[PDB]
Design a protein around this ligand. Structure first.
Ligand SMILES: Nc1nc2c(ncn2[C@@H]2O[C@H](COP(=O)(O)OP(=O)(O)O)[C@@H](O)[C@H]2O)c(=O)[nH]1
Ligand SMILES: [Mg+2]
Length: 168
């Protein structure tokens, strides 16, 4: 039987959670994907020679019922905490999600990657690579910049996260 890995996408609105999920899943950039939809996706992928299945839960703010949210988080094995390099407030918001995840999983070593998305909009960058890295260092997690549009580092973030999961 193939090993199953559960990944959870978290972050504020419009940072690219759905766009990253769909690029990785179906290899296509889907613009204006319905913002209030939360859904799960699964498929087989090859990680370092081994065939495994990845399950991705794409969350949305609309679903704010505590019991439901906490259940989704407790079921996740790794998290991609996404923000938009073009929105300073989304970067600041990452602290909020980090707090909720730590509250529910009580594990400061839980597989977690800080993801700065929309790297293709460099000319609108409001968050420098320096400040993002400093924060990542403080939480002892790695930082990766992606673009759901050009697909830069998209496979890398999911793959790197699965590797951390594989080691815990
Ligand atoms: N240029 C650019 N736009 C992006 C990127 N990722 C998402 N977007 C756009 O940002 C908007 C919000 O994306 P969405 O995936 O719905 O964000 P979510 O609310 O986090 O699920 C959509 O209009 C996307 O087409 C990216 O990497 N580059
Ligand atoms: Mg979405």
């Amino acid at each position: 039987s193939l090993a199953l890995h559960k990944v959870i996408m978290v972050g504020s609105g419009g940072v690219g959670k759905s766009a990253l999920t769909l690029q990785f899943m179906y290899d296509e950039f889907v613009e204006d994907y319905e913002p209030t939809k939360a859904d799960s996706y699964r498929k087989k992928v090859v990680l370092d020679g081994e065939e495994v299945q990845i399950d991705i839960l794409d969350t949305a703010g609309q679903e704010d019922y505590a019991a439901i949210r906490d259940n989704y988080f407790r079921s996740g094995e790794g998290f991609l905490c996404v923000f938009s390099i073009t929105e300073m407030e989304s970067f600041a918001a990452t602290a909020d999600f980090r707090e909720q995840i730590l509250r529910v999983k009580e594990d400061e070593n839980v597989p977690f990657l800080l993801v700065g998305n929309k790297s293709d909009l460099e000319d609108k960058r409001q968050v420098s690579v320096e400040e993002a890295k400093n924060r990542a260092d403080q939480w002892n997690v790695n930082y990766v910049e992606t673009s759901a549009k050009t697909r830069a580092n998209v496979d890398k973030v999911f793959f790197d996260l699965m590797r951390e999961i594989r080691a815990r």
